[PDB]
Amino acid sequence: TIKVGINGFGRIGRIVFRAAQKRSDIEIVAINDLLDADYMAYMLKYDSTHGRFDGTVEVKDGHLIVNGKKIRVTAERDPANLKWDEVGVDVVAEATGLFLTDETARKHITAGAKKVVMTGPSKDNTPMFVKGANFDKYAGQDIVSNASCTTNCLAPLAKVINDNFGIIEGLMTTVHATTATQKTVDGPSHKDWRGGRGASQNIIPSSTGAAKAVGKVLPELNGKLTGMAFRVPTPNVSVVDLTVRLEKAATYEQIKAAVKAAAEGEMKGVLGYTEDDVVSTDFNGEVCTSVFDAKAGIALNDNFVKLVSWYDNETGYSNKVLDLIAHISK
Amino acid sequence: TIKVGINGFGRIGRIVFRAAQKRSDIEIVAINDLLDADYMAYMLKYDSTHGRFDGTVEVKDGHLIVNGKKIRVTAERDPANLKWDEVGVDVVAEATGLFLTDETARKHITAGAKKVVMTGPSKDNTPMFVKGANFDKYAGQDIVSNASCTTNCLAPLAKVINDNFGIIEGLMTTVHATTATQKTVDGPSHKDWRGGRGASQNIIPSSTGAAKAVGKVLPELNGKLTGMAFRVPTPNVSVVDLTVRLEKAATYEQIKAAVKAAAEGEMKGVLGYTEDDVVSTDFNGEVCTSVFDAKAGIALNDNFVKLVSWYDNETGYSNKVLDLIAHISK
Amino acid sequence: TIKVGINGFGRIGRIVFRAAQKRSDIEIVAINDLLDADYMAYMLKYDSTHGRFDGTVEVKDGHLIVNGKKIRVTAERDPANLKWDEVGVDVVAEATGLFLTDETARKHITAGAKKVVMTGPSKDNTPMFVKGANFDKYAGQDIVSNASCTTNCLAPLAKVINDNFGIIEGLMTTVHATTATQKTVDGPSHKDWRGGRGASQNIIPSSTGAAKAVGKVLPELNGKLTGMAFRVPTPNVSVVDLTVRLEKAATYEQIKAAVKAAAEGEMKGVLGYTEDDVVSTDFNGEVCTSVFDAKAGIALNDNFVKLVSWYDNETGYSNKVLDLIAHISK
Amino acid sequence: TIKVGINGFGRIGRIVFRAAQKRSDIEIVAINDLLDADYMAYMLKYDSTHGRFDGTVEVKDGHLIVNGKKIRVTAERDPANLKWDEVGVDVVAEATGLFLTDETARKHITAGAKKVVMTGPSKDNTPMFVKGANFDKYAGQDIVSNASCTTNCLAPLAKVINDNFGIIEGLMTTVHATTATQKTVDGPSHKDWRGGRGASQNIIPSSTGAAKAVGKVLPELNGKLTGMAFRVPTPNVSVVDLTVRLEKAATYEQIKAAVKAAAEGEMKGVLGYTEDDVVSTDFNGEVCTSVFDAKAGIALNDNFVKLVSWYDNETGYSNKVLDLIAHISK
Ligand SMILES: NC(=O)c1ccc[n+]([C@@H]2O[C@H](COP(=O)([O-])OP(=O)(O)OC[C@H]3O[C@@H](n4cnc5c(N)ncnc54)[C@H](O)[C@@H]3O)[C@@H](O)[C@H]2O)c1
Ligand SMILES: NC(=O)c1ccc[n+]([C@@H]2O[C@H](COP(=O)([O-])OP(=O)(O)OC[C@H]3O[C@@H](n4cnc5c(N)ncnc54)[C@H](O)[C@@H]3O)[C@@H](O)[C@H]2O)c1
Ligand SMILES: NC(=O)c1ccc[n+]([C@@H]2O[C@H](COP(=O)([O-])OP(=O)(O)OC[C@H]3O[C@@H](n4cnc5c(N)ncnc54)[C@H](O)[C@@H]3O)[C@@H](O)[C@H]2O)c1
Ligand SMILES: NC(=O)c1ccc[n+]([C@@H]2O[C@H](COP(=O)([O-])OP(=O)(O)OC[C@H]3O[C@@H](n4cnc5c(N)ncnc54)[C@H](O)[C@@H]3O)[C@@H](O)[C@H]2O)c1
């Protein structure tokens, strides 16, 4: 049993919590956000996207009792005041989206935690890991990042394609679901003007470093990929549209065979494969971080192809956050 | 020319600004928010709901030049530091949604303004006015409130019905468009748990004092009305569903005749009337604050009827804010 | 087990099929629609609203094999040519929405079925039964109707209120989710002009006979209720807003006490009760046909109140279709 | 003036009608569809996407009177029985989407019309013309096609890029608004299974021949482009995402310079250029068929870039249908 403490009970914090209930090796013993225990119990119980929590949630004496287990609840705005050691926290899932550098996240280690896993791309040199891409390179570091949802989708796919055919260069577009940082109606978003426009009314272009980041987890692809994003009016589930130029010519059939083989072997549980007429909602709740859509992709010729891969930006990522926690715990 | 200064360039501040361009008696000479002049120019220029601004917008030396006219731009968080007198501001349209009491709004008068019009229901005893209901009671007060969008819809209708048939009692439901206070995905809303749930995914019940407030503008209806609201996934335009018990029996035809007559006489420009098969988008940009939908209403009997009335929560209200400004300016 | 055959594998037909899987007493043995087995398998497997089918579905020799059981598949456009004889069908869930009269629905009896349950309100005098309102009135009829989803929500609530406090008169509004009947963009809808307007962009007023239909399942309420609907931009789950005038004075606390009592007693499984800050998505998958929202309702006085009740228009109703099938087969 | 007759008063037929009102050279004198004059008047008057018709529309003796001009109204399901002779129709805007071949469309010539413009891509070899790409190639043909909305967006852009830097190969994706073809809720769509899934709930992968179709209006690009689409939850306005490999090295600044030059010169009115932080709604009502988004695009290197261009799939295209009508009538 690895004892985890969650900082930031948001979309990711809550989905990591629900995913943890199905794992015997990991156990959440404390949660911090800036909310009351009864309000947190409410956000755990009901979810517009994923449905009602299956289990019991009761608030007793300012703490949560979920399925019998007692969970310490705090509302400390500063991580240094979390006292993770009081509850015996081994690893902390840093999910606020505010402490993405070694110095801010290190506060949890000062507070008594042993290791920290950021649930977003680090903003400094903190190493990023993506399952299926470079977990094996982990060298015992105490602060680590699980990268972004888009990088978790792109990397495993990019790896299989490169290994078999060699990527000369590629450009990616992610059609992404609306997130907590957007607005309901045209509002202020000083650092992202487009991002402040009404989410339900618009297709909103957005820049993203998720493609370039693949170079950090798969060094051999460094400098060969980049891309952008379009935010669209759906509440969850996104898709990667990767246009790549191949070194070795490969028919679309050969590409499908390579992906399927990896989906069934080395990357089972990370990379998925499908030939069904799927749409985004079909992946709501999906745990695989990259699901190759065989019928959506199209090849101009044997060396220039467009590949499509689905990912539940909330669920797949959250499950891999747990995987990384177990991994770094040996 | 009445010189107006806008505090809070939000949905209401921006729509009041655009409506003012079509009025010769009123002129905006200054705007305050917590944004840069170039960002404000951007929010003025493009609107997801109402389209591009028709006119020229240029940012010169930290100020706006709209259709030739220079408009002072400030970003003072505290109203007491606005120096409205420097630009000769007569009336201020208080549109931040934060200064709804005499003492907070009075800061604008300290800052050099002569009168203040709140664009929301006052939270204290500041008098509320609704065009078609009680503008004639205005007695020279310096701080005034234009009430809420729902009250502006309900009051003129309630008045005509009461005058002709006498309201014994009534309960109102407003199916309302999503607003800036809601969330894109399930998030924190400590003072309104339902209001924090994903806006595009849900029908969200909400309490509202808009019905009871009709009693403040039409004292004779005090204690006879109340209601609630359902927030739905549309970006603009709302509708009042009023269930009333009548003193004098009246056929639905008689009710239509009374409303139409008022729409064409005493309440022209405030109360509208229609017999078309309309839907919400048909009122996007509507200036009348209450548009009676003759075909949507239904009568159980001559003394118990359900009446339906549309209102563009942004445009109708903004236009009446301007009307009140002119009214109080004599 | 009762062998059931489904005619019309649409939204209701499909949800009835899923619900039946969780019942030991009912068993679906044949399905009819105008689609190939492969397409039917795909529609069962994937659902945008309810998620992926919980089980295995294969196609073998033009027939479905769901969870190992063979299910005869057909494409007869005429009920008479269905041969329910062969497959041993006892009751038919008539879900096409085309045969809502004895004349047409009786073709299933001709075709070998013993009884028929229409999944919509009968257009002739075929008796309608609503669980919680009049199942006890069933008198051996071979063709019955399960009324509509809205009536299934309103009846159980209206009975509890009437029985305890006496409903003098009431007017209802249902804020309803979008249905297959609507258009994605402004299109032709000859029968109902408002209904052809873009579903996602509008609040669309609509007529409904659901309130009057209550008078047929609860005669004591005949002529005392009527209402209308507002179709809004959500994919599933609706809510009734009932404004009633009470004979016996009752405080909101007493109304709550009565409803809660019925929910835990005589109407267990039909009428639910909640005091949480729920929103529409919290009922997606809900089995009870009427879930009373304690906190959403509001009373003007002891004899005039607004009551709010939720219902998953697809799931609750479908489970009740199965309940009626069990009932008329006792 | 050119007297035009419209066949198919759908989205395109209606928007072509509105656009024609703003043109002195074209004049609509007759409309045909399978709807009554009253219903047609209602559909013209109210539009969920484009607002209320700017003018007067009356029905008199089963015919429309728009802005004082009489417009013959008909309901012939067969083109041959249209008698365009009587009304003096020169060109027919064939917008039903049913007659996309010479064989079928020629019935209008039989019926008295001089020429025909199909508002969709021809299914046979009827030549296609795209303003900005090959209008200059028109050689007197009496039946021509205006291609599709997507091709109208892609062609002008592809020509400017190819002419200046040489396109070796390209792969495109169009993130497209919802169309009348889609379903509001999971429904039957035999031809395209993904297309029957709930439009509002999903990102739906789709095929498109628009990229290949570029090869027919710009032969030099035949076999060098192909692509796909993603249908998303918005009512109007789409965007092409073009990933191309350049023969001649060009920096993004040089690509911008070339596009801006074409927008202000040879392609004025067809191809637009912008550097603002625009989103989809900013193009609702846009006349240019391809608006280059300078800031959204991204280059990996001097020979591999992603270009982004916006288009109001209804308005731009409709204005171009009028341009082609003017062109083939010179
Ligand atoms: N939403 C996704 O699809 C997704 C996927 C992968 C990674 N992420 C990343 O994970 C992080 C969280 O994103 P989210 O979508 O879950 O956001 P969110 O806004 O839903 O969650 C943020 C939570 O942190 C809480 N919080 C804010 N300040 C806090 C503080 N000082 N101390 C403790 N708690 C605080 C908030 O109250 C909130 O509940 C971000 O880095 C985001 O980029 C998001
Ligand atoms: N949206 C509607 O339909 C509607 C209709 C009628 C009345 N109202 C009311 O009007 C008010 C504004 O609502 P809105 O929807 O326009 O909101 P909004 O959030 O769109 O506008 C608020 C604006 O005020 C600015 N602001 C915040 N703090 C400020 C400060 N201290 N100083 C200056 N500017 C500041 C914000 O940056 C923002 O641009 C509220 O009282 C609201 O209830 C809204
Ligand atoms: N969906 C709801 O919210 C709801 C709730 C309660 C009752 N109902 C009722 O259920 C019935 C169907 O509604 P729905 O929502 O399932 O609609 P739907 O359009 O999804 O289902 C209709 C199905 O019937 C099939 N069909 C059509 N003609 C057929 C024929 N001649 N023979 C066999 N199959 C045929 C169609 O292929 C389609 O799959 C209606 O009476 C409706 O009023 C719907
Ligand atoms: N809407 C877009 O985004 C778009 C863009 C470019 C091209 N188009 C094309 O325009 C054509 C129509 O598309 P739409 O979007 O206008 O669809 P739509 O369904 O809105 O319009 C079709 C219209 O044709 C009418 N109609 C059907 N049969 C008829 C008949 N036999 N005789 C007369 N009228 C008949 C229908 O009543 C309907 O009003 C198609 O070829 C489509 O590909 C559409």
Structure tokens at C72: 């005869």
Is the CB of residue C64 less than 8 Å from the CB of residue C31? yes
Is the CB of residue D48 less than 8 Å from the CB of residue C186? yes
Secondary structure (DSSP) of D27-58: EEEEEE-SS-HHHHHHHHH--TTT-S-SS-EE
On whether B148 is known to bind a ligand per the annotation, the reply is yes
Question: 3-class SS at C219?
Answer: helix
Pairing of strands C69-74, C143-145: unpaired
Structure tokens at C89: 């069908």
| A239 Cβ contact list (under 8 Å, min separation 6) | A174, A175, A280, A293, A308, A309, A310, A311, D203, D205, D230
Question: 3-class SS at D154?
Answer: helix
One-letter identity of residue C144: V
Residue C275: exposed, middle, or buried by beta-carbon count in 10 A (0-12, 13-18, 19+)?
A: exposed
- Distance CA(A121)–CA(A129), nearest Å, equals 10
Q: What is the resolution of this structure in A?
A: 1.8
Measured between its terminal Cα atoms, the distance across chain C in Å is 11
Q: Please report how the helices A37-45 and A11-20 are oriented relative to each other, as an axis angle in degrees rounded to 10.
A: 70
Question: 3-class SS at D192?
Answer: coil
Q: Which residues pair with B183 in a beta bridge?
A: B198
- Distance CA(C165)–CA(D309), nearest Å, equals 64
- Residue B118 near ligand 2, beta carbon < 6 Å: no
- Helix or strand run (H / E) with residue D61: none
Structure tokens at D273: 């250029």
- Distance CA(C90)–CA(A240), nearest Å, equals 49
Number of other CB atoms surrounding residue C287 within 10 Å: 18
Binding partners of A (≥3 Cβ pairs within 8 A): B, C, D
Pairing of strands D304-311, D298-301: antiparallel
Q: Which of B115, B114, B79 is nearest to B96 (CA)?
A: B79
Q: Which one of A14, A33, A153 would you pick to mutate in the ligand 1 pocket, going by the greatest count of ligand atoms within 8 A of its CB?
A: A33
Structure tokens at C184: 């994605």
Residue C288 appears among annotated catalytic residues? no
Torsion angles phi and psi, residue C58, rounded to 5: -130, 160
Place of tokens 């059931």: C4
- Distance CA(B94)–CA(A277), nearest Å, equals 53
Residues with CB under 6 A from ligand 3: C 7-13, 32-34, 77, 95-98, 119-120, 148-149, 179-180, 313-314, 317; D 187-188
CB contact under 8 A, B279 and C304: no
Homologous superfamily of the D148-313 domain (CATH): Dihydrodipicolinate Reductase; domain 2 (3.30.360.10)
Secondary structure (DSSP) of B285-320: T--SSEEEETTT-EEEETTEEEEEEEE-TTHHHHHH
Is the CB of residue B288 less than 8 Å from the CB of residue B316? yes
Helix and strand numbers (H, E) in chain A are 8, 16
Architecture of domain D1-147+314-330: 3-Layer(aba) Sandwich (3.40)
- Distance CA(A285)–CA(A15), nearest Å, equals 10
User: E-strand spans in chain A?
Assistant: 2-7, 26-32, 57-60, 63-66, 69-74, 91-94, 115-118, 143-145, 167-177, 204-207, 225-232, 238-246, 271-274, 290-293, 298-301, 304-311
Considering only residues 223 to 252 of chain C, which have any Cβ-Cβ distance to chain B shorter than 8 Å?
224-228, 230, 232-234, 237-239, 241, 243, 245
Technique behind the model: X-ray
Question: What are the domain boundaries of chain B?
Answer: 1-147+314-330, 148-313
Cross-chain CB nearest to C280 (options B202, B237, B277): B202
| A61 Cβ contact list (under 8 Å, min separation 6) | none
One-letter identity of residue C66: V
- Distance CA(D17)–CA(D44), nearest Å, equals 9
- Distance CA(A153)–CA(A150), nearest Å, equals 5
Number of other CB atoms surrounding residue B136 within 10 Å: 8
- Distance CA(D29)–CA(D84), nearest Å, equals 10
Structure tokens at B177: 């468009």
Q: Which residues pair with C159 in a beta bridge?
A: none
Number of other CB atoms surrounding residue A206 within 10 Å: 15
Chain C nearest C-alpha distance from D313 (Å) = 13
Q: Do domains A1-147+314-330 and A148-313 have the same CATH topology?
A: no
Q: Which residues pair with D272 in a beta bridge?
A: D291
Torsion angles phi and psi, residue D136, rounded to 5: -60, -15
Q: Which residues pair with D115 in a beta bridge?
A: D91
Place of tokens 């003012």: B20
- Distance CA(A258)–CA(A253), nearest Å, equals 9
Is the CB of residue C49 less than 8 Å from the CB of residue D200? no
Is the CB of residue A167 less than 8 Å from the CB of residue A245? yes
The per-residue b/e assignment along B54-67, b for 16 or more CB within 10 angstroms, e otherwise, is eeebebeeebbebe
Number of other CB atoms surrounding residue B261 within 10 Å: 14
Residue A23: exposed, middle, or buried by beta-carbon count in 10 A (0-12, 13-18, 19+)?
A: middle
- Residue B152 near ligand 2, beta carbon < 6 Å: no
CB contact under 8 A, D51 and B277: no
- Distance CA(C193)–CA(C205), nearest Å, equals 10
- Distance CA(B96)–CA(B270), nearest Å, equals 25
Q: Within an 8 Å CB–CB cutoff, is residue D284 touching chain A?
A: no
Q: Within an 8 Å CB–CB cutoff, is residue D278 touching chain B?
A: yes
- Distance CA(B55)–CA(C159), nearest Å, equals 60
Contacts 24+ apart (CB under 8 A), B275-278: B276/D42, B276/D45, B276/D46, B277/C193, B277/C194, B277/D42, B278/B310, B278/C194, B278/C205, B278/D46
On whether C179 is known to bind a ligand per the annotation, the reply is yes
Place of tokens 């020279």: B140
CB contact under 8 A, A281 and D197: yes
Considering only residues 140 to 199 of chain D, which have any Cβ-Cβ distance to chain A shorter than 8 Å?
169-171, 173, 175, 177, 193-194, 197-198
Secondary structure (DSSP) of C241-288: EEEEEESS---HHHHHHHHHHHHHTTTTTTEEEE-S---GGGGTT--S
Residue D136: exposed, middle, or buried by beta-carbon count in 10 A (0-12, 13-18, 19+)?
A: exposed
- Helix or strand run (H / E) with residue B102: helix B102-105
CB contact under 8 A, A194 and D232: no
- Distance CA(A29)–CA(A86), nearest Å, equals 10
Looking at all shown ligands, the one closest to residue B108's CA atom is 2
Radius of gyration of chain B (CA): 20
CB contact under 8 A, C48 and A285: no
Pairing of strands A57-60, D26-32: unpaired
